[PDB]
Amino acid sequence: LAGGKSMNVESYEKILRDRQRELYRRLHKIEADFEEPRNPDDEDRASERSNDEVLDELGQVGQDELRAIDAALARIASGTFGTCVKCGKRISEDRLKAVPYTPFCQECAAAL
Ligand SMILES: [Zn+2]
């Protein structure tokens, strides 16, 4: 999909990472004693998504949300972010500003 213009992917790319990591440490409470008072203090703990396991102690809402974020980030890596996989067609910019972690258009999201 040649579509560089419209819907600024960079904004969505970073907010997807922000969303997945806060939800990651939320369900990684078992393996992460560190939650911090507010800020991370330092720059960044680059050890994220390094656990290639299912684990039932992870919240299913978080796992599913992170799967949707992972699919969205994978579309960015593929260069076809802003494409409903369930249509093979373009996504609304309003869809992605509200929820960038949907591989489905609002038509499909309401049809789920
Ligand atoms: Zn769709």
Sign of CA dihedral 8, 22, 86, 93: negative
Distance 59 CA to ligand 1 centre (A): 27
Q: Are 83 and 89 a contacting pair, CB within 8 Å?
A: yes
Distance 83 CA to ligand 1 centre (A): 8
DSSP letter for each residue of 49-90: T------TTS-HHHHHHHHHHHHHHHHHHHT--SEETTTTEE
Between the two ends of the chain, the Cα-to-Cα distance in Å is 25
What residue spans define the domains of the chain? 1-112
With tokens 């409470």, the residue in question is 29
Q: Are 69 and 20 a contacting pair, CB within 8 Å?
A: yes
66: number of CA atoms within 13 Å, CB side?
19
Cβ-Cβ contacts under 8 Å for 24 (sequence gap 6 or more)? 48, 49, 62, 66
Architecture field, domain 1-112: Up-down Bundle (1.20)
Distance 33 CA to ligand 1 centre (A): 40
Distance 30 CA to ligand 1 centre (A): 36
Name the experiment that determined this structure: NMR
| CB neighbour class for 86 (10 Å; exposed up to 12, middle 13-18, buried from 19) | middle
Distance 23 CA to ligand 1 centre (A): 26
Residues in the 5 Å CB sphere of ion ligand 1: 84, 86-87, 105, 108
Q: Are 40 and 76 a contacting pair, CB within 8 Å?
A: no
Q: Are 9 and 82 a contacting pair, CB within 8 Å?
A: yes
